[PDB]
Design a binder for this molecule. Structure first.
Ligand SMILES: [Cl-]
Ligand SMILES: [Cl-]
Ligand SMILES: [Cl-]
Ligand SMILES: [Cl-]
Ligand SMILES: [Cl-]
Ligand SMILES: [Cl-]
Ligand SMILES: [Hg+2]
Ligand SMILES: [Hg+2]
Ligand SMILES: [Hg+2]
Ligand SMILES: [Hg+2]
Ligand SMILES: [Hg+2]
Ligand SMILES: [Hg+2]
Ligand code: NA
Ligand code: NA
Ligand code: NA
Ligand code: NA
Ligand code: NA
Ligand code: NA
Lengths: 176, 180, 184, 184, 176, 180
């Protein structure tokens, strides 16, 4: 159950991701790095977890991370692997897994009108599947308009950059 | 016994929470974050634990956190998962569990900009389970603070809690403060 | 390693004392400071009583894992205290004397040439006994008269059944150790 | 998880590359700085060769525990680097491509408007093979032209069989990755 | 073998101790605490380790700390339990164990002509014996005359203070 | 095979050591301590490991530290036991083991007071064993330094080693430095 979901004809293993920023803080003295507190959502299909909600009498199943396969996401430009706590893993009748964690990380994206800081994400490859990262924009957001002391957030989006991918989450900021 | 309690009917599982602040301290140089030392109370009903106080020969039963289901609470805007020590888990004859922990956390709630007052926040959520709908409530008798001083330079005007929805439900503990 | 049963109907009284070795490292905001001390606990466990005459010993030594020991939590500390057991020794009547050396960062802000800092202690509840914290003033003391740089200690005492009581379930029991200090 | 045997008499060549993601946190004495990068290693293990036509795959993925992997040690770092494996993937001919993301505090002091910082790599010896470090310049690069605040990167390359060689037994093999920088 | 040595008629379990100071350093900004690097010697009799060096053909046996009983020494006024590495455990034919460790500790002994800083030692009690701390002055010393930057060492001795004891190692210092 | 090698005769076990300095750095604010990054070489004979290079089909054998006896070296004047990673253990046909580690340590050797020169020290000892007398020696071909700069402000004049007795035997690695 903890190997990758077996191929489905006609679709890759797409993993949809979103980051919702809760707080950015603690820009260091050189403005090279800063901490981020956020939620990371991931979503993908695992047909082995599909169920009939009519006969089963349920509409959503909850799992513990140890009981199922979960893509391994790596933030590229962070000081250390992020510090994460799983909040929710829930599966729909068709086998869509919705995974939610709260994380903390020190993002390495130096500050140089406005500019663009980056959080880059990749996923670890597996041999039975091609895992592809995508962005679900409904799950991408921010708690407010202030980056941290001195700087506003103009926008926060994500871009699929150069089967595989890397995600480039873009935080556009400007001086107050 | 470490799965969620089953319902009496189709009532959701209400978890009553309270935070009693012991100390706030160590505001950082940017006034973005500060430490909190406090008690967190949780209360909920687990009918499987119900007992007759006269057949059992005790009026309250004490449990160890591994021996019973306990809602998993996550503070949202903290640097790391809080550092907690369980103080007391005790169960009433009707199955009401009262849980008390003492915890420590660095709250991420930046101080402001023209006004002398402000509201800081501690947000709580609870992990979902599939056999019940879990609902956070506030028990105001278990909400308080040791004193009127937030930390050096700032008074506490009030400490209360409110329910708000998820930004995509949650408790918003509001600490209203003002310059001394 | 369950709690001792009663020698009748009596609550389980746990006498405590704190002997301060050193306070130091007041932080820049004078909010917190480190304390190095001994903590003494004493309580009766009849299951450990013994006849010293027949056994030929007047004290038995135990290892913390081998016996029940009350779980004390300091309330206003940054992290659970860092403790090393020094001595657990049992008298013929079952009186256990427990000694630990501990370290902790106490959260008790300095405000006003005269003030009272606090170390609050509670004990975890058990269901077979009512546990009650008491103070043994013979085991309460301090190495000297200096709190830390800049401040004298006027007195160190403890206050039993304090009315500070926050919550009626951490009302297993609470002690308020009071350090009264003044500017040098 | 022993070293691959020869496809004859050839040494075991391990091609390396470093792709710099970020350098940051130059210390107050400008003696040390943090580096966040990818490290690529590539080498042949015939025991992992496979027929892609019969098996229907063109790449196999492995977990670090399941295969032999050369043990690379950065010489002038404060502590062994902090690494997370990102990808291990094997081609039909047995070529293993290993990718890790790492962090390390590099000890390479800034002195003079122009200078060369170093990251030295060696590999641990094994007795069944002679291990030789090479540089794959296609896997050597940098995210941008700024070293860190105050300094540009002019170039990032590596130098093979360096004559820096300290000891003739850490002469399994040594690479000298050279970061040439200048004041902005 | 790892319980305490059985009583010997007519002597307690005396543990002789010595501290040889290698370096004192890193007096903190309030002059409340400072680090110490030193050797701690301990010596005591364990008759179960007595051997005949003639028939055995040896004059000293070496042991690993796990294989024998060793008194548990606690420094009282230190920030954390000392950080120790065993250097040597060697036993003589009559069962005298000589134990040597190198240690590091942050000593809590605030600086107030000359004064006296203290390192206090106790030993954990055991029920089959009365363990008594003593001072072996041949094993008490210092690498040099300078305490740390600004202060000389006048003397370093130890005193047995108020079966049981606590040792008070006394470092008398004065301004340069 | 993880007890000490037995003697050829009654010769003590000579352990040849060398330290090759890679970098010194991070002199503290009091100039009492500094970090060192270096190689430590140890060499000694273990006749049980001797082999015929023609029957064995290798000329040097490689070992893992758990599989053979290795002298335990302790640096005396360091804040904590050094932090070491083994790089190479290799054995010659005659049983000569060459061991190489890269290590890190905070050396406690305070800088001075009228003179522009000084000697800093790194002291090494070896743990005793009962079946052999272990004797530390210096192999000067394995002693060196990457360059002429100690750290910011100070040149290295020389780096050598000397035997001295125990203060109640030991190697005294002497780093002679002078102001730039
Ligand atoms: Cl990560
Ligand atoms: Cl939390
Ligand atoms: Cl505690
Ligand atoms: Cl490394
Ligand atoms: Cl200690
Ligand atoms: Cl060491
Ligand atoms: Hg943000
Ligand atoms: Hg507060
Ligand atoms: Hg004190
Ligand atoms: Hg860089
Ligand atoms: Hg000293
Ligand atoms: Hg050096
Ligand atoms: Na999993
Ligand atoms: Na539980
Ligand atoms: Na116990
Ligand atoms: Na491996
Ligand atoms: Na032992
Ligand atoms: Na070994």
């Amino acid at each position: 159950m903890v190997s990758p979901p077996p191929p489905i004809a006609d679709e890759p293993l797409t993993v949809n991701t979103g980051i919702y920023l809760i707080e950015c803080y603690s820009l260091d003295d050189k403005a090279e790095t800063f901490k981020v507190n956020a939620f990371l959502s991931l979503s993908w299909k695992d047909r082995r977890l599909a169920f009939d909600p009519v006969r089963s009498g349920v509409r959503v199943k909850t799992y513990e991370p140890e009981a199922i396969w979960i893509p391994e996401i790596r933030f590229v430009n962070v000081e250390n692997a992020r510090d994460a706590d799983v909040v929710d893993i829930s599966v729909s009748p068709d086998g869509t897994v919705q995974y939610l964690e709260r994380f903390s990380a020190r993002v390495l994206s130096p500050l140089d009108d406005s500019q663009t800081l980056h959080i880059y994400l990749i996923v670890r490859s597996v041999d039975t599947r091609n895992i592809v990262l995508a962005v679900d924009l409904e799950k991408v957001g921010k708690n407010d308009d202030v980056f941290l002391t001195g700087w506003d957030i103009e926008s926060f989006t994500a871009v699929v950059k150069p089967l595989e991918s890397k995600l480039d989450y873009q935080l556009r900021i400007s001086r107050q």
